[PDB]
Design a protein around this nucleic acid. Structure first.
Ligand code: CL
Ligand code: CL
Ligand code: CL
Ligand code: CL
Ligand code: CL
Ligand code: MN
Ligand code: MN
Ligand code: MN
Ligand code: MN
Ligand code: MN
Ligand code: MN
Ligand code: MN
Ligand code: MN
Ligand code: MN
Ligand code: MN
Ligand code: MN
Ligand code: MN
Lengths: 98, 95, 106, 81, 103, 92, 99, 85
DNA sequence: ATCAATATCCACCTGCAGATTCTACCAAAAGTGTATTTGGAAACTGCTCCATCAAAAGGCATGTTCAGCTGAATTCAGCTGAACATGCCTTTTGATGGAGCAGTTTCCAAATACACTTTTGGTAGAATCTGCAGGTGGATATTGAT
DNA sequence: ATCAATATCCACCTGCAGATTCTACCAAAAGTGTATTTGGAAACTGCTCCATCAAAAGGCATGTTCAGCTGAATTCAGCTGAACATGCCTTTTGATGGAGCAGTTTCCAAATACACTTTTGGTAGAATCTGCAGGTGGATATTGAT
């Protein structure tokens, strides 16, 4: 029987998802979320397919970027595990929560 | 001999309405003047662009209004939108 | 006689001057009659909001003349104005008193 | 029964992190990420719909989203910018 | 045409019309659309050349967004010019912080 | 209803004559030209005002370029820009 | 017998003090020289309005006081109370100045 | 006719860098901070003076105005109130 | 690292569908040719505002000592988060129709841009007015040693 | 649980530098009256968009086992804060020469406004090409065990 030591598949996945460009959230769950949120601002809205696609592009780029600064923050505290305090600290220095 | 103009006298009027026994130092008045000039420009530019996206030549009070909703954080927006809507109807009902 | 448009709108801020700044600012070809009025209103509302909060800051520190410190206290201590002007520096305004908890003695 | 933010699942949240070079993930990260994502979406959608409403439309267009993203300071190329 | 007169591929006439109709100023100099068109074309070539190299490096002959992204981020200066720009379908540069590698 | 596409492809062909471009890539390039167009035009727009001038001349465009472009990209842009203007004037 | 405050105590006094005031904290003339020096290594034979030097200082001090706030958070995040250059580097690397 | 300017970054003293840290609520300061701070400050100033002077020259002038600095600071995304902004 | 055995990865070839390229044509920009405007670069010059200089004095920067308490280095047990196989279910996706509604067109009424032509509101200094900065000296609070 | 050494505070005082008020000219609102658009309001269509439907295919949720990482506890050398003596140099106050903003005039080179006249760049069906996604079959990496 066989199994990789913890951390090893994690590195394989990093190399994998850094090499590709596919969206990483499933299209439909996200589409629900978008419509759900929109409905609180105006009701009975419709969306161009491209309008939902731009949004997803924007979100995944934003979040992938946020995990970059978060991971830097965890490493600064001499850790290798991101924690919410890392995300909070990155968002305060980006000035989103300052 | 050359003519600099400012939002001072108006800032001072409004000052007197709100705190009738309080003054304002010239440096503070300068800052206020810089604030009105800034916000004017932010709103006007967004308005300029909205007018364009709709293929319109004119900036209507409607454009100023959408620009206001876009630029101002929510409770400050609502009171501004109201004051604007109110001053415009007040204006039209005259000559 | 002649009645100013400001008075016609119930405003202290100068509607005529705001109309002139709009045409002459390369914002659009032509400018509607209500736009300078609606804009002068908004500017006056915001001015009034900052001056009310700043006046209180002056009075909390026993002065009767508003200085830049007072503008800064009003703006940073108010969450909405703070965000509106979150990337603005106010010359001679200083900072809010704030010492991280972790730094105090036992 | 289900909630929609929760449709943004752990596997997916793990993948975004991985693109960001993240190796180990505290189990609390996932609910935090949904919170952040929801503020990001709200802030952008709100502006986009304000564009829709101004254009007297009932349909959010890709341009409404692009204009929104631009004034949020997150300019997007590829959708009509 | 004015483009050919300037040696340019980019449409000098159009750049002028966009300048007039964009409310930037009352009038527009004869040279400004030329100078701007020149500038747009230069930057365009700079990115396409670098992206062309990115395409060729991965045994591809058609530039896709990944290639535009590899090009922009790997160049310090273009990176700074578009430092707050997101490229749909561009991905990110391969980069793993050292401390995360096995011992 | 119109685009900078045909110029991008022209420029693509001088530089990599055997390289093609995906439609999604062509958008990005178009969004890039539009962006930069607007950045430079706007800074030039303000520059003309600070000097109380009614006209945007190639001078305003170049200062706007020195202000918007990182130091080495600026220099080359200024060159090409000056080069297209003299070549243009010297015609009839 | 002599008297002395325990280390850290005066530091805290100084924080309360400088957070209560608004005066510039760099000396006026040394800062002016720095400006003239930098400007001149970029264009010669330049002159400056007094307010232009004062505007620059205001901006620079507001920027630096702002940078030390973010720095100080980074130190605390590392379970320290002493700011170090690696903290400033982390602050600037987020924040987009070194990204 | 002129005097030569040089090493003026050292005019930003340690006392002065300590006060700025204190207004930022900083309690303890590593000894490497002060030269790091001079590094960051000099870049901050070059970037602002460079753009300001570009405004001065475009105005065909020989004198940097407070307004040149304000416009400079604005396109940097550090808007300044108090000097004619 | 050798000795061995799962899995992962990388290369070379290959057939196909989805996009890309290549061809075939019309309103609308772009270019021309006139006929006027008009901005703004040149050319005096009235006058702030800068650079410089001098000179005296205290606030503050420098440099040194000395020890408190902080950062860093080590150690270590528990418990969190990774890997992995299982079993179910939500997402994908593929066409099929229907209707909601963006994207164009076509009119005229309402509103905005002009052009002059009186009529004030604002601005720039002069003439006053009045917070508060800077200095005391005394009750109250904080901190640190025994 | 105290006193001693300091720092901090709050009030009361007073003349001055900077705020407020007082007056006199001009740029710019306001007023009317033609001369133009333009933003909407209505009527229609082609087109994307929502609603379903229906299998299959992965992709997700669950639970088990254990590795290794995070947080705690202790230790200690040495860095950094507090206090002190010395005296440099910044800050303050005050004038002086003259560079260079800035305010006005003047007048062509350059730009805008028609009026046609041509050319190009978009759009909708026509025609090859590039990768994608699968297939081996050969090394590679990773991990467990003499
Ligand atoms: Cl036709
Ligand atoms: Cl003229
Ligand atoms: Cl005392
Ligand atoms: Cl002279
Ligand atoms: Cl053609
Ligand atoms: Mn020109
Ligand atoms: Mn030098
Ligand atoms: Mn036809
Ligand atoms: Mn000394
Ligand atoms: Mn010791
Ligand atoms: Mn002892
Ligand atoms: Mn410690
Ligand atoms: Mn040590
Ligand atoms: Mn219906
Ligand atoms: Mn009057
Ligand atoms: Mn006092
Ligand atoms: Mn164990």
């Amino acid at each position: 029987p066989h199994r990789y030591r913890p951390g090893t598949v994690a590195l394989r996945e990093i190399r994998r998802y850094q090499k590709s460009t596919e969206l990483l959230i499933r299209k439909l769950p996200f589409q629900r979320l978008v419509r759900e949120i929109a409905q609180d601002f105006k009701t009975d809205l419709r969306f161009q397919s491209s309008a939902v696609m731009a949004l997803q592009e924007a979100c995944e780029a934003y979040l992938v970027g946020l995990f970059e600064d978060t991971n830097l923050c965890a490493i600064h505290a001499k850790r290798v595990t991101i924690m919410p305090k890392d995300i909070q600290l990155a968002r305060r220095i980006r000035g989103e929560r300052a | 001999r050359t003519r600099k103009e400012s939002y001072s006298i108006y800032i001072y009027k409004v000052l007197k309405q709100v705190h009738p026994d309080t003054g304002i130092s010239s440096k503070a008045m300068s800052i206020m003047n810089s604030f009105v000039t800034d916000i004017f420009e932010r709103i006007a530019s967004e308005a300029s662009r909205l007018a364009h996206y709709s293929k319109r030549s004119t900036i209507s009070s409607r454009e100023i209004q959408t620009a206001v909703r876009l630029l101002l954080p929510g409770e400050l927006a609502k009171h501004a939108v109201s004051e604007g809507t109110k001053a415009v109807t007040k204006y039209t009902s005259s000559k | 006689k002649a009645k100013t448009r400001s008075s016609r709108a119930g405003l202290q801020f100068p509607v005529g001057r705001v109309h002139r700044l709009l045409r002459k600012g390369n914002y659009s070809e032509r400018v509607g009659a209500g736009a300078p009025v609606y804009l002068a209103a908004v500017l006056e509302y915001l001015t009034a909001e900052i001056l009310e909060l700043a006046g209180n800051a002056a009075r909390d520190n026993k002065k009767t003349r508003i200085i830049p410190r007072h503008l800064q206290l009003a703006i940073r201590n108010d969450e909405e104005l703070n965000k509106l002007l979150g990337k603005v520096t106010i010359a001679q305004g200083g900072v809010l008193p704030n010492i991280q908890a972790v730094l105090l003695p036992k | 029964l289900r909630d929609n933010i929760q449709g943004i699942t752990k596997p997916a949240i793990r993948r975004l992190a991985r693109r960001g070079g993240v190796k180990r993930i505290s189990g609390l990260i996932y609910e935090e990420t949904r919170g952040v994502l929801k503020v990001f979406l709200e802030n952008v959608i709100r502006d986009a719909v304000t564009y829709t409403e101004h254009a007297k439309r009932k349909t959010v267009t890709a341009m409404d989203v692009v204009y929104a993203l631009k004034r949020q300071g997150r300019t997007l190329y590829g959708f009509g910018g």
